[PDB]
Homo-oligomer: A and B are copies of this chain.
């Protein structure tokens, strides 16, 4: 239930790095984390041309191809599996957008699937990630902004933390968090938390 499709515990425990991807209706963000829990890259971008009343596959292709052209190679690419269902009609536009994004990411990031048939793109249960970080109110999630801010601006550093930021990147990551803090880019926070949760729940059991 946590991860789909089903990957052998062997390939999961031997991961060297993942790219965790989270998107909304307006923005997308991703984080590259290695098995040392080091944040090798962490980016967000406002894909403002999407979700403007039309569902043009050609525009989705241009946007998603541009997004992934900035991603380094990783063992797995992890997307959110949300709680949206077909029964609610008022959420149809969002659900359709999410499935198109997910479909092209599955297709474009599985660069060798046609030759080896091994899945590299996974969907991770967002509700389970929310419970893991105690971000739930009711059965929905609250913001992980404050929890990410703790990781990024904690003072102690006298015990092994749950996530590491390199020295060359920590200055940029902090300027990125503060410059986008007023806009509250939830996808940026959620991509980091999903990557941490992937290692804590699926790699280092």
Contact = CB atoms under 8 A, between A and B. Distances in A.
A102 B4 CA distance: 22
Interface residues on A, range: 20 to 34
Given A4-B56, A96-B95, A107 B103 contact: yes
Stoichiometry, as copies per complex, reads 2
Contacts of A69: 114
B99 A61 contact: no
Given A89-B92, A92-B92, A106 B61 contact: yes
A40 to B, nearest CB: 22
A71 B94 CA distance: 33
A5 B103 contact: no
Given A4-B56, A58-B5, A106-B58, A65 B100 contact: no
Overall SS of chain A's interface: helix
A120 to B, nearest CB: 10
A166 interface: no
B5 A106 contact: no
Interface string A46-60: 000000000111101
Nearest to A111: B114
A113 B61 contact: yes
Given A61-B119, A104-B104, 9 more contacts: A4-B58, A5-B56, A57-B103, A58-B123, A61-B113, A68-B114, A92-B96, A96-B96, A103-B107
